[PDB]
Scaffold this active site. Structure first.
Site, PDB file in Angstrom:
ATOM      1  N   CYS A  31     -24.545  -8.635  -4.674  1.00 48.43           N
ATOM      2  CA  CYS A  31     -24.228  -9.810  -3.857  1.00 48.43           C
ATOM      3  C   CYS A  31     -23.721  -9.434  -2.469  1.00 48.43           C
ATOM      4  CB  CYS A  31     -23.222 -10.702  -4.584  1.00 48.43           C
ATOM      5  SG  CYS A  31     -22.498 -12.037  -3.602  1.00 48.43           S
ATOM      6  N   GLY A  32     -24.431  -9.890  -1.441  1.00 51.73           N
ATOM      7  CA  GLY A  32     -24.041  -9.654  -0.057  1.00 51.73           C
ATOM      8  C   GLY A  32     -22.620 -10.082   0.298  1.00 51.73           C
ATOM      9  N   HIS A  33     -22.232 -11.296  -0.077  1.00 50.29           N
ATOM     10  CA  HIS A  33     -20.883 -11.759   0.236  1.00 50.29           C
ATOM     11  C   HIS A  33     -19.834 -11.019  -0.567  1.00 50.29           C
ATOM     12  CE1 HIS A  33     -21.879 -15.832   2.360  1.00 50.29           C
ATOM     13  NE2 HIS A  33     -22.605 -14.825   2.813  1.00 50.29           N
ATOM     14  N   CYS A  34     -20.206 -10.541  -1.757  1.00 45.66           N
ATOM     15  CA  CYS A  34     -19.324  -9.666  -2.525  1.00 45.66           C
ATOM     16  C   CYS A  34     -19.120  -8.344  -1.802  1.00 45.66           C
ATOM     17  CB  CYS A  34     -19.889  -9.398  -3.922  1.00 45.66           C
ATOM     18  SG  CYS A  34     -19.851 -10.872  -4.949  1.00 45.66           S
TER      19      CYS A  34
END
Length: 116
Positions: A31-34
């Site tokens: 996950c990018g935002h992770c």
């Protein structure tokens, strides 16, 4: 870092059985935002060291843990206060400053609960 890795094996002992305020990030590694949250989560964990416990669950690997807590999107941040069976969602900005502010606010509630 100062972030505690949480798994189905240690979650009860570390979080549920704890008198401390806990913030837990449920993430997936892809996950990018992770990925973007990671250094900010680390910063908050260090600022809150010995004050608030800060943990993380790979809820892609441990999808059972994610399912138990109704994790939908990643990253999901849950605040575990006085009643460890009733975590609340943190839906504010994913920055160290915003996270610490929410943590200190929840910490106030936890301490008021003890006092009363």
């Amino acid at each position: 870092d100062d972030v505690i890795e949480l798994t189905p094996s240690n979650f009860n002992r570390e979080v549920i059985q704890s008198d401390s305020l806990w913030l837990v990030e449920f993430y997936a590694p892809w996950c990018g935002h992770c990925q973007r949250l990671t250094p900010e989560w680390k910063k908050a964990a260090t600022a809150l060291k010995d004050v608030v416990k800060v943990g993380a669950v790979d809820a892609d690997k441990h999808h059972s843990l994610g399912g138990q807590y109704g994790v939908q999107g990643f990253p999901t941040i849950k605040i575990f206060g006085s009643n460890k069976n009733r975590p609340e969602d943190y839906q504010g900005g994913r920055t160290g400053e915003a996270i610490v502010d929410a943590a200190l606010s929840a910490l106030r509630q936890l301490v008021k609960d003890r006092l009363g």
